[PDB]
Write a protein that binds this ligand. Sequence first.
Ligand SMILES: *Cc1cc2c(cc1C)nc1c(=O)[nH]c(=O)nc-1n2C[C@H](O)[C@H](O)[C@H](O)COP(=O)(O)OP(=O)(O)OC[C@H]1O[C@@H](n2cnc3c(N)ncnc32)[C@H](O)[C@@H]1O
Length: 431
Amino acid sequence: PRANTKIIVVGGGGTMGSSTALHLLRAGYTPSNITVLDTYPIPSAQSAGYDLNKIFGIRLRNKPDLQLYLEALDMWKNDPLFKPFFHNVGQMDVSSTEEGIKKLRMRYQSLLDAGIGLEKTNFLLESEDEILAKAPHFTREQIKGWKGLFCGDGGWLAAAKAINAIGQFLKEQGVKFGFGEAGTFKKPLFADADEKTCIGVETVDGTKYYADKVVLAAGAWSSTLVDLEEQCVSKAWVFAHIQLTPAEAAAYKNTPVIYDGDYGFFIEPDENGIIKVCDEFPGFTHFKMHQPYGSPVPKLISVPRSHAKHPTDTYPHASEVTIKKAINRFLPRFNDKELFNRAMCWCTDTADANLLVCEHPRWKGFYLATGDSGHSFKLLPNIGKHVVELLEGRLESVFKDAWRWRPGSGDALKSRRAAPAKDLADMPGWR
Ligand SMILES: *Cc1cc2c(cc1C)nc1c(=O)[nH]c(=O)nc-1n2C[C@H](O)[C@H](O)[C@H](O)COP(=O)(O)OP(=O)(O)OC[C@H]1O[C@@H](n2cnc3c(N)ncnc32)[C@H](O)[C@@H]1O
């Protein structure tokens, strides 16, 4: 029974972890029977969801994407917990190359082919007046030859504030927590030597926790903690910040997310006039030597870098150039603004960009909730519901099949992206 079942959530201070913790409580699980274990207190300061904002937008690259999007949209708009952090300003994809424009038109036609009537809230913009109509901060000279795709259900998400909102609820309900070395996963605990029955986890300080079921939602650290057999390759993307005065930020109030595949994107300034700018690239890996549990031999795994141990860290010099090019494209008036809060954000890719959400093949009672593939923060409100369904053996096949244990199903180093990720050991400047 739910009331008498104990669950351990590793990485419960992150996106998929806190979501799982939330839906356990909603399902009627006893709060004191739930134990969240994360290196950092929720919201985890090293979590990929520990950001000013993320983008919410429709994307149909896999079979479960449509239902996951519709589910999250419904909750981002109506759920009293998540609603205050969704800003529905829309999103616009632009391009001036013939291949980029070609790609816009195909993405638009892709939405139509779903047959649910997405053409009602998604429009192609073939004129310059149509573009300026939805994004008046551009100039007519700037957007000469641009074509646009406007998705109206889009917008951005107050990321860290949303995870923090879940955390406040968890603590207020009486969920037990473990931080620092007492919250840092080391290995699972087993009943016998055959290791076919998991009964808990041990942290790096030696502390042991016992429960009926364990959930591993360690994000980009998952493949370093347990042996995922190269199903997940962790990569880092980059962003920077610029600050506008209230008078400068005025022309961008309620502005749609602007995106161009050949440059990157930016989001409207927040409460403090801060604009974030990402670029567009396959990501950076960081292979460092590590022994994940389940592997008999120290493998070389892409491990996220610790900002705590490396304070001077920003990002490679190549990133500085591409971020400045993005700024020159979208916000040329601010080309003299200073960049600050340069940082790297870590995700983990699967081969087909589907999630990795499944019970461990051998470790019965041990479950995996990772494989975010750098596009899953949008699933914060609803992903935890399906993880619970997995634990109770009620996950529908459309999700269970795509999220299945699938080693040797392709190369996650390249994934669905344009190129294999380069490593930070070959990029100068970030250290
Ligand atoms: C990097 C990035 C990602 C991103 C994005 C922009 C950037 C720069 N923009 C997005 C967007 O616009 N829209 C969107 O939908 N997603 C976007 N993303 C991706 C998103 O951030 C990730 O997909 C997602 O956040 C990852 O989820 P996950 O739950 O997997 O990740 P996490 O929050 O990092 O969770 C990890 C937690 O695990 C804890 N941890 C790590 N190790 C341990 C150990 N050993 N023991 C206990 N806990 C551990 C971490 O501390 C963290 O709390």
